[PDB]
Ligand SMILES: COC(=O)N[C@H](C(=O)N[C@@H](C)CCC[C@@H](C=O)N(CCC(C)C)S(=O)(=O)c1ccc(N)cc1)C(c1ccccc1)c1ccccc1
Ligand SMILES: [Cl-]
Ligand SMILES: [Cl-]
């Protein structure tokens with residue numbers, strides 16, 4: 001699809017068999033989701049935001065479907081204001097910016 | 100142009116007679132620039148997200164040139180770790196997400 005930016009570019013994602021709403025975020029290097037259960041082990045990660053840095057849990061090789069496109073990659077879990085799909089998965093789904 | 104997301108989508112902007120590098124950020128509601136001077140009236144504002152909130156100065160009706168496309172809009176100025184072009188100005192240059 002082609003998504004304009006007059007409103008937040010919110011899409012439905014599917015992860016662990018559940019639907020969530022998430023923001024397609026070209027400013028985010030990484031995908032970060034609100035607290036949830038994910039399978040497997042996690043590793044520590046620090047990410048920097050507008051307000052400073054936070055600690056998050058890093059899960060690798062996680063299956064996630066984004067606006068109907070399947071991806072398998074790194075998902076960080078922690079105290080984010082909204083679920084955010086970052087460049088690590090935007091590239092998997094073939095997303096570009098155009099003007 | 101078509102800008103891929105393999106790397107941060109950084110472009111050159113011109114604002115207040117200064118050339119700067121800024122991030123095209125579909126996740127950002129607002130445009131936020133590192134500390135700089137701008138003409139005219141401003142009011143304080145808090146903007147938030149990952150990490151928490153920061154206080155910024157809000158300047159309205161500011162001329163900006165983004166990757167050679169002229170726009171006008173609100174520019175926030177404050178302690179952001181990176182110059183961000185948000186949706187308020189992305190729309191004006193006709194920027195879309197495509198996949
Ligand atoms: C008054 O209105 C607001 O304050 N709106 C919020 C908003 O747009 N804020 C933007 C001006 C500023 C944050 C834009 C945002 C993404 O690239 N970031 C900046 C880019 C990095 C590289 C510096 S960020 O918050 O630091 C970030 C960093 C890393 C990662 N993985 C994800 C996000 C907005 C938000 C949108 C997206 C991410 C974080 C916050 C928000 C939503 C819900 C509740 C509170 C605030
Ligand atoms: Cl990944
Ligand atoms: Cl505006």
Ligand SMILES: [Cl-]
Nearest residue numbers: 004005190193
């Ligand atoms: Cl349009």
